[PDB]
Design a protein around this ligand. Structure first.
Ligand SMILES: N[C@H](CCC[C@H](N)C(=O)O)C(=O)O
Ligand SMILES: [Ca+2]
Ligand SMILES: [Zn+2]
Ligand SMILES: [Zn+2]
Ligand SMILES: [Zn+2]
Ligand SMILES: [Zn+2]
Ligand SMILES: [Zn+2]
Ligand SMILES: [Zn+2]
Ligand SMILES: [Zn+2]
Length: 417
């Protein structure tokens, strides 16, 4: 759970409080790319929006809906030995908090919903491009009139239509009065705790940038009805949405290793160091996005950005000695100290100074065939590199690794501008 709040605490009580959820199935990327882009490029000026950007992370990592069955069918009867029993108990705690007024759950669904039959793709049994409620009202809620909030939200979405077929409509499922599937579902538990709950569906038949465009129009619409004010730093059209999701300024950081670009990496990275006696889900990880992770696949380890594969790691396990903090280096004529885990920019040349009990291996450069080398003490230029060992496709980024006895001591990266 991540909060999105005003930079000054005084404003938190000044507007209502929304709970925003997505990723309860791992194969619905419109939903969790939208929660991600909201977290990165928007600001909430009054009130609060709490976000769980992906509820079932093990499944998002395996591009699979469910893994332990459906998570959106486990809010009623549930055996105490079920594997996700602890996780739904926590989600139930989040919904039931006093300070939460409203809930929005984001989905991607098949076809295009219509309130009457038209053909196989367009009918009341489909889920795509609609906005959803359990009941027309909820006696006891702060905002009890579900039906009106929905209709004004839909009006807003339709003023910005790309093409005529994507038009939005309302869908009421009348949950308390018949169908037993929605009785086991998330929003029905939420109205039983007297909260106003909603769902948005975008059609699985659209390219990713269009699905996200509509998930963002829906959020922008609902926040307007609740009077939670906001600001974004970009123009909302499909071309601009495509350019923020595929942004060349995105990064990820594994354990104590340095920051790496997300896009334009090589497909496979070899002899990549990782800590021993530590199961893969326990290895720390960081990014300027909220949907990044690691997952074990036979012998390799995969780096994921939502459902996109960004590179395959071929690892090797070794103790991580934390003793070494910094290293001395010359860059474009000037001597300086550089901390373990940095990135540095070079126009012409660099040089590494030697150390006690520490060994250094510049990956892509070599001076002999001895397989545990020490390449401290050489003046090195761009033309001295074997370009195939670069970390990127543009052939400008290279690794430097440090060792002591049988232990890994740290990494640094160089970038040729
Ligand atoms: N395709 C979805 C519809 C979303 C239902 C909504 N009430 C929620 O789960 O919050 C499903 O079959 O569950
Ligand atoms: Ca080397
Ligand atoms: Zn921005
Ligand atoms: Zn049992
Ligand atoms: Zn779904
Ligand atoms: Zn219509
Ligand atoms: Zn795209
Ligand atoms: Zn392999
Ligand atoms: Zn020296």
């Amino acid at each position: 759970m991540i909060e999105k709040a005003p930079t000054n605490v005084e404003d938190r009580d000044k507007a209502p409080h929304l709970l925003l959820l997505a990723g309860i199935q791992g194969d619905e990327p419109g939903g969790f790319n939208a929660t991600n882009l909201f977290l990165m490029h928007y600001s909430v000026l009054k009130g609060l929006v709490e976000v769980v950007p992906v509820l079932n992370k093990p499944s998002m990592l395996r591009n699979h809906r469910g893994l332990y069955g459906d998570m959106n069918r486990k809010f009623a009867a549930l055996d105490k030995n079920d594997p996700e029993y602890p996780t739904i108990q926590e989600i139930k705690s989040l919904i039931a908090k006093p300070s939460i007024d409203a809930v929005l759950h984001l989905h991607d669904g098949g076809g295009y919903y219509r309130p009457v039959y038209v053909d196989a793709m367009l009918n009341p049994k489909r889920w795509g491009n609609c906005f959803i409620i359990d009941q027309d009202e909820v006696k006891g809620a702060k905002f009890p009139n579900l039906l009106a909030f929905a209709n004004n939200t839909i009006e807003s979405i339709n003023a910005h239509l790309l093409h005529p077929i994507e038009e939005y409509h309302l869908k009421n499922t009348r949950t308390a009065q018949g169908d037993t599937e929605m009785q086991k579902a998330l929003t029905f538990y939420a109205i039983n705790q007297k909260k106003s709950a909603f769902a948005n569906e975008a059609s699985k038949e659209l390219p990713l940038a269009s699905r996200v465009f509509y998930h963002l129009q829906a959020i922008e619409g609902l926040l307007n009805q609740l009077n939670i004010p906001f600001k974004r730093d970009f123009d909302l059209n499909p071309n601009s949405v495509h350019a923020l999701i595929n942004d060349k300024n995105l990064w990820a950081k594994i354990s104590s290793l340095p920051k790496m670009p997300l896009f334009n990496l090589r497909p496979k990275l070899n002899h990549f160091p990782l800590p021993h006696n530590t199961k893969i889900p326990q290895i720390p990880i960081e990014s300027n996005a909220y949907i990044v992770g690691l997952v074990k696949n036979k012998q390799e380890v995969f780096l994921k950005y939502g459902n996109k594969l960004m590179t395959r790691l071929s690892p090797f396990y070794i103790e991580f000695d934390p003793s070494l903090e910094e290293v001395k280096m010359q860059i474009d004529n000037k001597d300086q100290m550089v901390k373990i885990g940095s990135v540095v920019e070079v126009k012409e040349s660099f040089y590494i100074h030697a150390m006690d009990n520490i060994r250094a291996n510049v990956i892509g450069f070599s001076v002999s065939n001895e397989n545990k080398p020490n390449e401290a003490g050489y003046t090195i230029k761009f033309k001295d590199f074997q370009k195939r060992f670069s970390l990127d496709k543009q052939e400008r980024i290279y690794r430097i690794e440090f060792y002591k006895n049988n232990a890994f001591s740290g990494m640094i990266l160089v970038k040729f501008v």
